[PDB]
Amino acid sequence: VTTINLEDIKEICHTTIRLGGKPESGEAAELPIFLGSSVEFEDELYDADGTQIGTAKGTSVIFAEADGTVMQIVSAFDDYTDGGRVTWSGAYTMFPTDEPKSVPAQGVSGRYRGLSGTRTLQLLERPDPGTSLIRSSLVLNG
Amino acid sequence: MSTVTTINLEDIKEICHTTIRLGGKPESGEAAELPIFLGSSVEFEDELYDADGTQIGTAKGTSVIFAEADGTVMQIVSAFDDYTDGGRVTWSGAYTMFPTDEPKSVPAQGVSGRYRGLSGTRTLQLLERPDPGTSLIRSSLVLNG
Ligand SMILES: CC[C@@H]1C[C@@]2(C)C=C(C)[C@@H](C)C[C@]23NC(=O)C(=C3O)C(=O)[C@@]2(C)[C@@H]3CCC[C@H](O)[C@H]3C=C[C@H]2C[C@H]1O
Numbered sequence: 001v002t003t004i005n006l007e008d009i010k011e012i013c014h015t016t017i018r019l020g021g022k023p024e025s026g027e028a029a030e031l032p033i034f035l036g037s038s039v040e041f042e043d044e045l046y047d048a049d050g051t052q053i054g055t056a057k058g059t060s061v062i063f064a065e066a067d068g069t070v071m072q073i074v075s076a077f078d079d080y081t082d083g084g085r086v087t088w089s090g091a092y093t094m095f096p097t098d099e100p101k102s103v104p105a106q107g108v109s110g111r112y113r114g115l116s117g118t119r120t121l122q123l124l125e126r127p128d129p130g131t132s133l134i135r136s137s138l139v140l141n142g
Numbered sequence: 143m144s145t146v147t148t149i150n151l152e153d154i155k156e157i158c159h160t161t162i163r164l165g166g167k168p169e170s171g172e173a174a175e176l177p178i179f180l181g182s183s184v185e186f187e188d189e190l191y192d193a194d195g196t197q198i199g200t201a202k203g204t205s206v207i208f209a210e211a212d213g214t215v216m217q218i219v220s221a222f223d224d225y226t227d228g229g230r231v232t233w234s235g236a237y238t239m240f241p242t243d244e245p246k247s248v249p250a251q252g253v254s255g256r257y258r259g260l261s262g263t264r265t266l267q268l269l270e271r272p273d274p275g276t277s278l279i280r281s282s283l284v285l286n287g
């Protein structure tokens with residue numbers, strides 16, 4: 001029963017933010033629709049030694065669930081240097097913002113294929129609007 | 143051996159129950175102190191039938207409306223299927239919202255049962271909105287690996 005367990009990953013996250021809002025022209029303007037704030041992000045993954053273990057790409061949008069709690073929905077994947085890809089996606093409470101956040105993950109290729117689990121992220125520093133610093137962990141089981 | 147295994151479910155009749163929220167400006171709490179917008183979202187729970195009429199599973203997920211840099215209105219979905227044979231398939235991704243009647247497709251991953259280790263595409267096409275709470279959808283799931 002194999003367990004992949006990447007801990008204390010250092011994630012440089014390059015963030016392209018759009019606040020969205022009420023659509024003002026196009027097909028969306030004629031509909032009861034609001035454009036959520038979104039972030040397109042492009043990450044580099046490093047182990048403790050400072051070696052690049054992979055990359056990441058995904059997108060996250062803000063919304064609120066049935067009770068009014070502010071949430072975010074993410075869809076993303078990691079391409080790791082040794083071969084495989086791991087997808088991760090789900091919703092998580094937005095606040096507090098320095099809290100560790102987790103969503104289910106699924107290994108799809110390489111040595112991760114057929115394994116599922118959880119990808120975790122936690123904001124450490126936000127030097128500027130285009131860069132976020134995160135410590136991550138990945139736990140996969142099968 | 144070096145043999146590809148595939149799953150191909152076509153012409154699924156998917157009855158989808160939608161709980162829709164408008165979104166907009168957050169007017170209370172920590173979120174109201176920031177220039178963020180809550181997207182219009184839908185939380186759905188589906189029943190899946192094959193063409194013969196026998197149920198083959200359920201689905202549950204969330205989708206939120208946003209836009210990309212050029213202003214193309216998009217949705218991002220995160221869902222999973224649970225099938226009657228026991229296995230589980232997650233699917234998630236972004237897709238252009240318009241036209242709303244064209245088939246939309248996002249990546250899918252089999253995670254358990256006969257689907258484990260296979261990845262591909264989950265496709266959904268809206269056929270009717272018989273009431274504000276119900277979608278009738280034609281869907282398909284393709285996985286290989
Ligand atoms: C809820 C945790 C989140 C941290 C994390 C680390 C959590 C994730 C799951 C990863 C995808 C990476 C993320 N990194 C991020 O920069 C990020 C993230 O989604 C964001 O959304 C930011 C930039 C928003 C963009 C939308 C508009 C806001 O002005 C902005 C206000 C702070 C953060 C939110 C931050 O508090």
Ligand SMILES: CC[C@@H]1C[C@@]2(C)C=C(C)[C@@H](C)C[C@]23NC(=O)C(=C3O)C(=O)[C@@]2(C)[C@@H]3CCC[C@H](O)[C@H]3C=C[C@H]2C[C@H]1O
Nearest residue numbers: 032160162182183184205219239242246266267268277279
């Ligand atoms: C992209 C088109 C979409 C087709 C599909 C079939 C595509 C999907 C990937 C599935 C999740 C199933 C969905 N079915 C759905 O009812 C659904 C879906 O996202 C929706 O978003 C609805 C309810 C929105 C809710 C958010 C606010 C909008 O005012 C509303 C206006 C009609 C539909 C849009 C529908 O036309």
